[PDB]
Amino acid sequence: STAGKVIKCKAAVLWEEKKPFSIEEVEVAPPKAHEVRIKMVATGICRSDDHVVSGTLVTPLPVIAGHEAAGIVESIGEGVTTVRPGDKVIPLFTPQCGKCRVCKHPEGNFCLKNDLSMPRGTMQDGTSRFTCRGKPIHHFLGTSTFSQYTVVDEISVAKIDAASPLEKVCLIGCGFSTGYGSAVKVAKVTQGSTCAVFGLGGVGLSVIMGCKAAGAARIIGVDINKDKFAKAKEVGATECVNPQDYKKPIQEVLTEMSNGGVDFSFEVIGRLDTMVTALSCCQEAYGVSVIVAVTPDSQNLSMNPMLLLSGRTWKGAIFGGFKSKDSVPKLVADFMAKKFALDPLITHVLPFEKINEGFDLLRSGESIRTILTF
Ligand SMILES: [Zn+2]
Ligand SMILES: [Zn+2]
């Protein structure tokens, strides 16, 4: 009925930088070999999407953004073997080709087939399945979830539980998985340990949740906005510290509080200064500090390697260090198994068409996470 031919639908198009999203009638081309066409059900608004808008994250324009979502597969191309029409699916902004050195390496997940490093803004074959008035529209990280229908390469989609709430499990496409994974997979937080999370936004809450899952005894939440503390404690935070309430430097406060430094610290804001703070505040001989996010508009941090010589470990990851296709389904499984909540993160729900409004909520910071329903 719809398989095999072009689909006319609405999508959120960004024609230029620092411009609101324009709701356009686009033509989504059918999936070629090893491609999957998805009917979007719910997509989240992540800060990285806003980074496209502000030109911070350089990627080809015009483009259809979005990378945190879920939906239903309407059809598949010839060769697609991992998903079938009707399957609930979550697109992967970080691929899992399962062939490159990385996918084969037990510690890597940043698949070399990604479009993050050197953005092309296309499907794997270098072309686009998007057109708006005959004009071509770029893809975003091989996902482009800001559309009623999108087309992704097979390596960029994972089949999930056929009974999962897409309005909720979409956070596994990025937000939740990133924070949670940073604690559980990346940092590998241990029981009885003390953790310090910098930034209590959606991702910070996910990290906290990861620490709580890992059995941390103390989860010190750090943020200058007191309004984020209740949600924090609610998700696991044992304590909350607002740096503006202190005269002494924050690492000094965190060091003393942890009687010598924390076990694991995570920076989730993307701030160069707090990145060094987080690192310092963890015990000098065996602390681990995790970089969960870094703003695209590159700027170097200034740090003394002496902080590392004593024994500290500094490391970051993308998508919580999870191998996308293998992890996503399991994470949805663990959600369906009540192993963690997603609702504490979902703070606003808007119809897809009010996307701009959702971004206004983001920029104002009065939002933890907005979900656009189609
Ligand atoms: Zn994201
Ligand atoms: Zn790969």
- 264 and 344 co-located in one domain: no
Instruction: Choose one of 285, 317, 349: the last residue of a domain.
Output: 317
Q: How far is the CA of 97 from the centre of ligand 2 (A)?
A: 4
Contact by Cβ (8 Å): 268, 292: yes
- 313 and 364 co-located in one domain: no
Residue 198's SS3 state is: strand
Structure tokens at 260: 């010598």
- 151 and 235 co-located in one domain: no
CATH value at residue 289: 3.40.50.720
- 141 and 263 co-located in one domain: no
- 366 and 257 co-located in one domain: no
Find the ligand nearest to 155 CA: 2
Resolution, Å (one decimal): 2.8
Find the ligand nearest to 108 CA: 2
Q: How far is the CA of 327 from the centre of ligand 2 (A)?
A: 14
Residue 68's SS3 state is: coil
Instruction: Choose one of 317, 333, 363: the last residue of a domain.
Output: 317
Active site residues: 46, 48, 51, 67, 174
Give the chain's domain count: 2
Residue type, 52: V
- 222 and 329 co-located in one domain: no
Instruction: Choose one of 296, 317, 338: the last residue of a domain.
Output: 317
- Which domain range does residue 92 map to? 1-178+318-374
- Cα–Cα distance, 312 to 232 (Å, whole number): 26
Contact by Cβ (8 Å): 161, 72: no
Q: How far is the CA of 301 from the centre of ligand 1 (A)?
A: 22
DSSP-derived secondary structure for 115-165: SSSS---S-TTS--SEEETTEEEB-STTT--SBSEEEEEGGGEEE--TT--
Q: How far is the CA of 284 from the centre of ligand 2 (A)?
A: 35
Nearest-10 Cα torsion for 96, 98, 101, 103: 50
Find the ligand nearest to 43 CA: 1
CATH value at residue 329: 3.90.180.10
